[PDB]
Amino acid sequence: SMITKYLYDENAYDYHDGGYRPLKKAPGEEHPLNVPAFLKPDRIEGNEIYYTVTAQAGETKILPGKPTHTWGYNGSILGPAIQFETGKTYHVTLKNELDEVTTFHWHGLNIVGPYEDGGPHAPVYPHGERKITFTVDQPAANIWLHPHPCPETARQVWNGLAAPVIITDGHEQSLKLPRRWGVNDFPVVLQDRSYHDNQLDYKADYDVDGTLGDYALVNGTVNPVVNVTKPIVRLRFLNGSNRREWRLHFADYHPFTQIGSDGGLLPEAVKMDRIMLTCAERADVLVNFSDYQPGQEVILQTDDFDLIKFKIGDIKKENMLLPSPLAEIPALSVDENTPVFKTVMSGMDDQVRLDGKLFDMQRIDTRQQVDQTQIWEVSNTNDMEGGMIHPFHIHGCQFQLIDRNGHAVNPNEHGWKDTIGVNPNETVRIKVKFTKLGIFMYHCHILEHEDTGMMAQIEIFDPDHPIEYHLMPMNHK
Ligand SMILES: [Cl-]
Ligand SMILES: [Cu+2]
Ligand SMILES: [Cu+2]
User: Fold this and answer.
1) Do domains 10-13+176-312 and 14-174 have the same CATH topology?
2) CA–CA separation, 62 vs 66, rounded Å?
3) How far apart are CA 104 and CA 98, in angstroms?
4) From ligand 1's centre to the CA of 466, what distance in Å?
């Protein structure tokens, strides 16, 4: 009972779209996979860690010839790996060294909003700075940072801003996991881009239904290679693309083990020979290369396209061994006096809507009490023939899946999730408990759909501990 299918509906994959373009071989030689260094703290006082993160412009050598003008956090493209630990408090200085407004959103982080959350209510102006403070109150997980200024998010991510973020805790520490960063533990941020005289040009490539790129850009590198020197490797996959889905597998269908989802370690490790990710989903995977011989090249693909080359070195054979259960996920329970909240995604291209509306920065579409678990029922009304899979995301929480069209959820969806692909004609039920007060967004994570307005806000409140929010209209740009 290894999983041997992608877990979304094939009738609706990206490649059914009339504008779809498959990935092509990028020019130049093979390069070692870039692995970002961890961000060093500025100061440590008690359980209080100080970081600084700066959005900035630079030049990154990507393709043969001229370098590519890009944006990055603390560097020219992407960002450093940022480590958080459950129970610690962080003071993070957010500097904007670009010439337009950004925000710093910690996708997957349980943090109050709408200011610390770094969605569209939290502009950092050009040359400006904002400071946030927060305590991490969720288990170990792979999460990420990216910008969120409505309606410029898609372009900003295109231009290069995204960083991988790791939360660790004692449980994950207790496991015997590959942990030599850049040697047997890798971030794998999957993106796709097109270039024009080696440069980015979002406006040229824009599609309102989701912008696709011609080349595969992995951690900001084209034609990547990994030298395998220890056989058990952890790969922290993130779909960081604006729209493209990634259907990941080894060329020979060599099995691997999913150990984690968006919001953490899964309750049991899942053996599979392939996995599909929609926008913003994460899968934390172990691969054991021990059955290959030194000098072999093992190729990870998406669809039939060569994605990363693994060069097998002088490799002493080893075995994985994971406990069962892998982790304890506490079940949320709902009050059973509480109704089901229904939200409906509909349309494609510029006709996308969320409950028949487009986002309004001043409109609070829904409310829900802090610490109360509620069932949400998320629907996509696109046709089975011709529709698309919309990745649905909620800020400020991790949720659990109950069912997909009344049947069992996918086998890698029994833990904590924050982004969920919703297939055409499908109805998915989740359980959602908000643990922090504030205003949070929920939306499609196809960036162009988000920017069109396939997005809504929810106010999370404590009765007799109320607060009034002074939501502003969007600045006139
Ligand atoms: Cl390759
Ligand atoms: Cu988010
Ligand atoms: Cu969408």
Assistant:
1) yes
2) 9
3) 13
4) 54
